[PDB]
Design a protein around this ligand. Structure first.
Ligand code: EQH
Ligand code: CL
Ligand code: CL
Length: 243
């Protein structure tokens, strides 16, 4: 029950909470369902049950669901990721004019690729705002604007589409900007179809630039598979998750 936890403070509604029994630090996401139709609530139950299923080191862990029919509020209790989201890291870098270490980029590439491999197996938008960092250098995938990560196929007509999006995310991690920018989606679609972009900064190795470039190939069948990505000599044991 909700009484089993103590709210410490609001993060984003998302809140940092402390479990009373053992003092474990978690977060929960608030969801007022008071205004939902029966149909929309059924979908919510099926989705929440979906989330309890997937267990993986590189996917935000969902522990519990708490119903409070009083305020008609649903609480999804989950792992706390002290490093926050990847979008903020990029913003911080953009402002402070400071590029991220290649080591960090390799970690994100390795651990998100493992998250994707798992998602594909059980068959999650892959943007920086949906990628979280914990306290031990681990990277976790969680669950109107310009569609920077839209793939060529998605613009018309596929796991290789996920590879493209990962390519976009990693590219932005390095350059601190997306590979294709524009003011309107039509202009954007134009640039994507051309498939051209700047090389990531020179502080980054040719090998790293090479694989990000491959993920951004116009032909889905030229993009590396999850398996081919992980075979890359760049990727080592220490880049993986550690408890
Ligand atoms: N489980 C989470 N832990 C931490 C955080 C954030 S995000 C930016 C600030 C921080 C912290 C350190 C002060 N966010 C989450 C989540 C929120 C939403 C969620 C989902 O859509 O399921 C992913 C995890
Ligand atoms: Cl550059
Ligand atoms: Cl882990």
């Amino acid at each position: 029950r909700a009484e089993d936890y103590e709210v410490l403070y609001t993060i984003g509604r998302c809140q940092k909470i402390r479990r009373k029994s053992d003092g474990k630090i978690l977060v929960w996401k608030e969801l007022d369902y008071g205004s939902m139709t029966e149909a929309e609530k059924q979908m919510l139950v099926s989705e929440v049950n979906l989330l309890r299923e997937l267990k993986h080191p590189n996917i935000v862990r969902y522990y519990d669901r708490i119903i409070d029919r009083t305020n008609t509020t649903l609480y999804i209790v989950m792992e706390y990721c002290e490093g926050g989201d990847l979008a903020s890291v990029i913003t911080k870098g953009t402002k402070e004019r400071q590029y991220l270490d290649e080591e960090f980029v390799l970690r994100v590439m390795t651990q998100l690729t493992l998250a994707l491999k798992e998602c594909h197996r059980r068959s999650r938008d892959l943007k920086p705002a949906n990628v979280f960092l914990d306290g031990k250098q681990n990277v976790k995938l969680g669950d109107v604007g310009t569609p920077y990560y839209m793939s060529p196929e998605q613009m018309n007509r596929n796991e290789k589409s996920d590879i493209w999006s990962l390519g976009c995310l990693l590219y932005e991690l390095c350059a601190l900007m997306p590979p294709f920018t524009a003011f309107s989606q039509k202009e954007l679609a134009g640039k994507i179809r051309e498939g051209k972009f700047r090389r990531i900064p020179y502080r980054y190795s040719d090998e790293l630039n090479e694989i990000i470039t491959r993920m951004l190939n116009l032909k889905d069948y030229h993009r590396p598979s999850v398996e081919e990505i992980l075979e890359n000599p760049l990727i080592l044991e220490h880049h993986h998750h550690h408890h």
